[PDB]
Amino acid sequence: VNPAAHLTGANSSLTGSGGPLLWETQLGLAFLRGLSYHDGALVVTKAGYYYIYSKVQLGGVGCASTITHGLYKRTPRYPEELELLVSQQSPCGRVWWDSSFLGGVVHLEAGEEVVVRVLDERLVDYTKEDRSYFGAFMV
Amino acid sequence: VNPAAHLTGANSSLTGSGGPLLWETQLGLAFLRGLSYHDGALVVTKAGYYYIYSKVQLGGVGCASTITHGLYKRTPRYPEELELLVSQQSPCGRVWWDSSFLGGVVHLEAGEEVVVRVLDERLVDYTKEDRSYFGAFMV
Amino acid sequence: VNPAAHLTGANSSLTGSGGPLLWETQLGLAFLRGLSYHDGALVVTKAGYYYIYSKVQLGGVGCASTITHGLYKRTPRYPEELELLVSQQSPCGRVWWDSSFLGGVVHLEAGEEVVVRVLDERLVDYTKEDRSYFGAFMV
Amino acid sequence: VNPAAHLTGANSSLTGSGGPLLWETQLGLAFLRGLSYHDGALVVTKAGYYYIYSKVQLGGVGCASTITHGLYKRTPRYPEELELLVSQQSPCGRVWWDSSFLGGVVHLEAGEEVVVRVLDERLVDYTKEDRSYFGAFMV
Amino acid sequence: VNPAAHLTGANSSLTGSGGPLLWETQLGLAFLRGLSYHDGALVVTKAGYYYIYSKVQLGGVGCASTITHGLYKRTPRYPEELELLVSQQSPCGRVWWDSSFLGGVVHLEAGEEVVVRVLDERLVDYTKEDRSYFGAFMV
Amino acid sequence: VNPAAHLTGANSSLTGSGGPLLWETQLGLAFLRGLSYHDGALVVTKAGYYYIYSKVQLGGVGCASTITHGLYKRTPRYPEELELLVSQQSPCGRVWWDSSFLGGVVHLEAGEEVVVRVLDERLVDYTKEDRSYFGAFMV
Amino acid sequence: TPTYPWRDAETGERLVCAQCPPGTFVQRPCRRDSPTTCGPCPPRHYTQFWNYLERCRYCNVLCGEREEEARACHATHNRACRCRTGFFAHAGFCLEHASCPPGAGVIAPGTPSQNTQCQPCPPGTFSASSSSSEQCQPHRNCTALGLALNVPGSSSHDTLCTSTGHH
Amino acid sequence: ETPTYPWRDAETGERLVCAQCPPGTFVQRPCRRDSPTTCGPCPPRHYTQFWNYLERCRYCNVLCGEREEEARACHATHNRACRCRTGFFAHAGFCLEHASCPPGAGVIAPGTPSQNTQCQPCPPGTFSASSSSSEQCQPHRNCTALGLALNVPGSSSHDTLCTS
Amino acid sequence: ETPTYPWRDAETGERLVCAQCPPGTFVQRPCRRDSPTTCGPCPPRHYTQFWNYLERCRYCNVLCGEREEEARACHATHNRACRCRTGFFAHAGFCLEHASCPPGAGVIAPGTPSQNTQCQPCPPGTFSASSSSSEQCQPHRNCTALGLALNVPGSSSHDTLCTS
Amino acid sequence: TPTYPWRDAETGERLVCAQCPPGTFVQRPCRRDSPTTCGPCPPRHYTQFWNYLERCRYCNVLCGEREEEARACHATHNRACRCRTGFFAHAGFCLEHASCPPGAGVIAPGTPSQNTQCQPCPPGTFSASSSSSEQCQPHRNCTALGLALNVPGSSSHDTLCTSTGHH
Amino acid sequence: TPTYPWRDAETGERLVCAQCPPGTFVQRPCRRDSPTTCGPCPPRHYTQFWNYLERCRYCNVLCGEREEEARACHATHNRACRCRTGFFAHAGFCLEHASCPPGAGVIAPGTPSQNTQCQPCPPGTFSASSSSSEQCQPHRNCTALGLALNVPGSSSHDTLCTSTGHH
Amino acid sequence: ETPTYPWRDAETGERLVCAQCPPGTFVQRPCRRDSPTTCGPCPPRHYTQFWNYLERCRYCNVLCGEREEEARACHATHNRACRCRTGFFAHAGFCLEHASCPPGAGVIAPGTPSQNTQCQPCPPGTFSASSSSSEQCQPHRNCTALGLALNVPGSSSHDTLCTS
């Protein structure tokens, strides 16, 4: 069975703490198959190369004119997050909408984790499960 | 044999009806392998989790300042399309170009379909097979 | 063993020659598994359908207001590159940042190659391995 | 009695002939005192230096994005207008409004005339007598 | 002696009552010579035609995005102000600065007054006597 | 004879010394009548109140994004210029054009002078006599 | 009856003259032996208040090409203007009523005062067109028709049914 | 009557015509040779709005933002729906604050959940002195109705004053 | 002469040097021990522009938009190519309408498929009265050439009038 | 010969005086016994038409730093200006001729009247450079050279051949 | 001592009068028998240089609502203004000091002359907050505390440790 | 003392508590029954900044751009870091040229690697004649200090002249 997951924006997604986004893992389009989840992280149980992705729908009113959207690894072997795939966008150039998508193949051991962070978080629309999400699959 | 497809923008792509985009399925870079196509829909024949994607090249002159690009499921079990992966973009902020990409893993049964819709459709450049497309593969 | 690769932006990435970007293939997040690399090209050794992708982080100061980012095939059977997946973006609409992502499934024979090109090249930020990259995997 | 006049925008003001603007000379705020009027022109009957002035209220919806507002002399001695006081404004940088004001001292002989021209004329708001006008007094 | 005056922006200039601007009449550059002043108004004591003028220095941070700058007559014969010379400007198209200037000849009787109003008044820079002002002289 | 003058933009007009603008005094529309001129300054020979005015045609390509246009008094009694009438404009908000106009009544003694300064001076279009100018008349 | 002060020219005596009502102006001031003569305002002029003007005000409100009279110039009031059919007023302009695109429908039509209002079509309804009159309409209802579902609808396209049941 | 759906019996293989399930329900178990379709009620946070033969109800996936309240709750037969809270209007997917009419202009229509404040310049004989999202143009104080004389003429932005 | 390509014979394994196929063709079958490369003609909607050894011709994948017409058709040896239709010019991947020279300015060059209208302000003694994408600056009516006297001086935007 | 009316000052008789041709002005009006004396316009002044000016017009067209004379001030005409080499005229300015970037080439060079024109290099051609003179050039043609194809070219890079055939 | 020329009115003799120092103005010019009388500038007026003004200059620098006096109007100088606490000067305005968002921290606080300066938190440090005082602070250091690592930190969140070691 | 990490011995399966490796090192080989953790030094282009048990050092993946120089080199214990070169300041991820104070304004603070030039309008009695990113407002030449008379009053953009 090939690990896969797709996690969706949820009412709890934006903590305001500067930490990772949280996600839904079972309702509507969300699911886990051969991966786990823990406090915002996808937790890997089978080691290998994974294609990881995330899309965030961004939006706001006028204008931290720069948004960073990224996927980061956590390993117990080092006490700081490691960057995997990051984008910077300045879409504030009244109402605007932009969506940021990231995907890429990374190596992950059992027990390592992946998270998503956006700065600033508040520009993320979490109100719709089809518009912000985070997933992966083994390749 | 692992299902896959990549379908491309075609001269017939923009119906003007408010329905789904249509696509080419055999010429140039388009193909089907273990999936089918019917009036704009990829039709699934083997049940499972698929990574689905689509990219549309958008462009126009000045400025419905908001574009929605999405992938939607159709099932005979419910009489309305279901949203899978959607983006909203306001790129009109004279000549402009922007491209919107969507990808994500979804569960699809045999007999279900996936389509793409863009509103407004008219901003989609269908004149180049490398710039608007829709595909999938089983994961 | 399923072919995969993920190649990253490097100090040598922007040749200025109008040719393809170059990439790192072994340090930090870069790797090759069952694919090769030669002067900017991923070189295929096992024939099949591949999902190919690339992300480039773009940025600059004010304002060739149009950027083209694409993935192109090279085959010994034809003396010109073939377009696979291309985007055009006009993000110059002082400091700005935008990221362009492309992905899609294509058929590649043994011995064929894939490259990335951006015009104009100079707007690509190659200084961070997490922000510009090029990879693939067989599907 | 020291010659003076103040002429106001009228319903006839925009001929669309490429000729000068026309003006009201009697109703509301408009008057002539020791100057005459004929077909858009202030006609001088007493020779001397005059301060001439004109204000035009300009306005438009989005967008020759350049507006020229000028006062010009006609003399029977020479078969072409002479430019006196001219402004160029590019105010189109949705609904916008801008006022252009011109004033200055010129020497005028009896039998010479002064006219106002705007290019493009149709951006002139002629609907309010307090907003677009043309006058003079001897100094 | 030919009536004239030049009144300057003052610390009291913006009442915020929706009434007219107030002005300094004695200090620095301000003076009255054969005209009077009461509560924001130039008061006419000698009947005749006057060239009246006013300049307001406007400025703001980003953004009724439309500014109206006008001169108005009050007469005891009628219980409402009469518009004389009015400009509408939409200069907000970050820090911005713009000057609005009005001038024109009007007939005024003894006992009539002239006031200046700006909407919105708070965009008026009243801090420099050389920048916002109101005056007149008989012609 | 009532003092008046109108001076026009000339080829010498922009010294680039940070000193005042220079002006033509005899050719085309320029004249002096009961006022003098020396090194950019209108020189007063008869004491009284004058309406002074100046218009500068400004223009540029894209972009101190703030332009200051002013009239200043020099007197032998005090070793610094006095500001009379000053405007600040931020018109740079590609090719743009804007006109700045200043007028007002000031008291001047014999032997006092008036000069015009623009910062930044190089945005002044001095090529057309009808477009940038400086004058005065006694009131 | 509001008044104003005056002086008889023959005697110098102080007078108290009647002002003149809306629609009129002082054609002749009072005298010791007659009241103020109030003239009716001529065409293109008005007085809206009691007054002692010697000339009525000018009806200076002119209607643009995208406007029409909401009120005519009358002796009692100035003319006034509103946007013509198809246009609404904004920032002293008359703009074209927007269209609601496919996927969305009209919830209030445009007026001279406001622009078309629009919502995204809710579930079960659609609008296929860019229109400034078309509302979100309910999808064709295959079950109510006793027909099979052929293609599900969306917010911008109607549901399609076949032409028969299933058996 | 009740709409239907074709179904190949698993282990019979005959073409059955089964009853679909009604809004508020979903198919717990398909129809067989002898048994009708078994329909179950949508659990909380889920719905079906139409007849259907879903094996699980759709998820109530509309979430209200901080500027928004429920116009409808999540029910067995419909998803949640949201409208802009008091003081805001729905524009391009967002909830914007109701605008204010400056001095010189009056409210001709209150802001609602779908509509910004509507404003017009105060017509002659009327006034508004403040920036407000409620205050309408009011007629000038009428000095002759109160039996007083005129002190200071009013404007589109100031009331007429009368002398005591 | 004819360009070539190396090829490992399937079932011989020797290195052959085969003839490539010419523009308008593709390789139906590779060269063997005794047989030359077999070249076939590109079917409709397909092309090869260079010598090649493609197993299938490239697809003619250039499509003209509504503002565009074919400058070249899809041929066996080249792809389709498009230019802007009459009244438009090619700018940044789009087809824009030719601009108009306002009154006061005249056309100094017609718009073409690659070029916008070119305009200049009417020099002295010349005029243009209308916004037009054809009309050039014309010299003023010359009153003395017609034997008439001057009525109204002309401008950069109005013709000189002469009195009868 | 166009004329203007005048009066003899000694007699009061009506006169019909000749106007003055391009390049001249009326230095002295006609008299009963002499024609109008037409003076030649001094430096920096012109008359372009028949006229009865008493002073010629001033040559007031000044050339900016990015411009040069297309025509000198002459007694018959005012000065006129055009953009210097490397610049084109737009909106009363003189702008730098654009460069066509890599992937695209010049199809018309810039002039004082127009900007550089550019196209995307068609199939078989390339431009490697950002340039306001470089055109799309045909790819190096390996088959014509009898050499093997090493790396295929693109619209912004030339095809590379090896240095020998295949055999 | 700088001077100016004058004339005695009784005799017509030429005089050489003293100018007047900063803080004063010429209230009365010199005479043959007395020096110039220099008056002190009244409130709201100044002279900053030696001068022979007959009235001092007006202190015309007014402070806006976001400003306060850097110097008072004095007889020797005009008033001058600076941005109040929390604001910096830019383009003749007083703007709010920016905040450094999460992920970044203050390296210089704002002043009346400059805006807050900000950097992205370097490795090992964090800022969790949007703040115009908060600096990048070092992550909680699990090894120095003898505690196990629970969740690694980032540039915008602190490292979490458990409450015990591993053994 | 030395921080640690749990580890299941491969082939014993007991829970060991191993020493982590220090900054500048990584784990060449894990701790066993009898042997301590074996730590190796980071090779060039690699680092570890904290105690760790990485099997390979992190890559020094910060690259300086053409506007930038190394503030720190890649070391065994830290990544490279970059700052803006002389003449530039760090704004929103970019290196912008230091701005110039126009005539009428003077430098009140030099530009640095983190900070743009700071400018103010020249206060009374002071001047700046040029656009410069160094030049401050200077006091006017004082004619009375030099024993001269006034020739031309100065401004915020021109020096006072005195007569010889």
Ligand SMILES: *[C@@H]1O[C@H](CO)[C@@H](O[C@@H]2O[C@H](CO)[C@@H](O[C@@H]3O[C@H](CO)[C@@H](O)[C@H](O[C@H]4O[C@H](CO)[C@@H](O)[C@H](O)[C@@H]4O)[C@@H]3O)[C@H](O)[C@H]2NC(C)=O)[C@H](O)[C@H]1NC(C)=O
């Ligand atoms: C095709 O037509 C059929 C009719 O033959 C139709 O089915 C109907 O659907 C509606 C919409 O879901 C149903 O209305 C509901 O009825 C139930 C009770 O059985 C109510 O509980 C529902 O909830 C209301 O409750 C809220 C309070 O909490 C209200 O405030 C709110 O207004 C809710 O709507 C609801 O009214 C109706 O039951 C069926 N009718 C039948 C006979 O099944 C179907 O919708 C049509 N299809 C399409 C695609 O348009």
Ligand SMILES: *[C@@H]1O[C@H](CO)[C@@H](O[C@@H]2O[C@H](CO)[C@@H](O[C@@H]3O[C@H](CO)[C@@H](O)[C@H](O[C@H]4O[C@H](CO)[C@@H](O)[C@H](O)[C@@H]4O)[C@@H]3O)[C@H](O)[C@H]2NC(C)=O)[C@H](O)[C@H]1NC(C)=O
């Ligand atoms: C390397 O050089 C070789 C020459 O030794 C070269 O091959 C040549 O290519 C061109 C371009 O494809 C060929 O030109 C074509 O010739 C055929 C007939 O054989 C024509 O039918 C073609 O069509 C024309 O038809 C249209 C009308 O419908 C015309 O309007 C239009 O202009 C078309 O071009 C076309 O002319 C030519 O045949 C070959 N020559 C040989 C000997 O093979 C090759 O292109 C060069 N390689 C590179 C990479 O530049």
Ligand SMILES: *[C@@H]1O[C@H](CO)[C@@H](O[C@@H]2O[C@H](CO)[C@@H](O)[C@H](O)[C@H]2NC(C)=O)[C@H](O)[C@H]1NC(C)=O
């Ligand atoms: C102000 O108040 C008075 C009455 O209370 C109004 O005066 C009347 O005006 C109308 C309009 O022409 C006349 O027909 C009446 O005869 C007047 N009556 C009196 C007693 O004066 C007046 O119109 C009011 N003004 C406004 C603008 O509403």
Ligand SMILES: *[C@@H]1O[C@H](CO)[C@@H](O[C@@H]2O[C@H](CO)[C@@H](O)[C@H](O)[C@H]2NC(C)=O)[C@H](O)[C@H]1NC(C)=O
């Ligand atoms: C208008 O028409 C007349 C002739 O048909 C022109 O007059 C001539 O002007 C030239 C230029 O100096 C002289 O050399 C001729 O001798 C004139 N001849 C006559 C008969 O008048 C005139 O130049 C024309 N004007 C313009 C601007 O073209």
Ligand SMILES: *[C@@H]1O[C@H](CO)[C@@H](O[C@@H]2O[C@H](CO)[C@@H](O)[C@H](O)[C@H]2NC(C)=O)[C@H](O)[C@H]1NC(C)=O
């Ligand atoms: C210019 O130079 C002179 C002295 O070298 C200054 O004159 C002095 O001014 C102060 C200020 O009021 C007095 O207290 C002194 O008594 C003056 N002395 C002399 C000898 O004149 C003057 O202030 C300087 N000006 C400026 C602006 O710095």
Ligand SMILES: [Mg+2]
């Ligand atoms: Mg619609």
Ligand SMILES: [Mg+2]
């Ligand atoms: Mg109001």
Ligand SMILES: [Mg+2]
């Ligand atoms: Mg024209």
Ligand SMILES: [Mg+2]
């Ligand atoms: Mg090029």
Ligand SMILES: [Mg+2]
């Ligand atoms: Mg912070």
Ligand SMILES: [Mg+2]
């Ligand atoms: Mg300076």
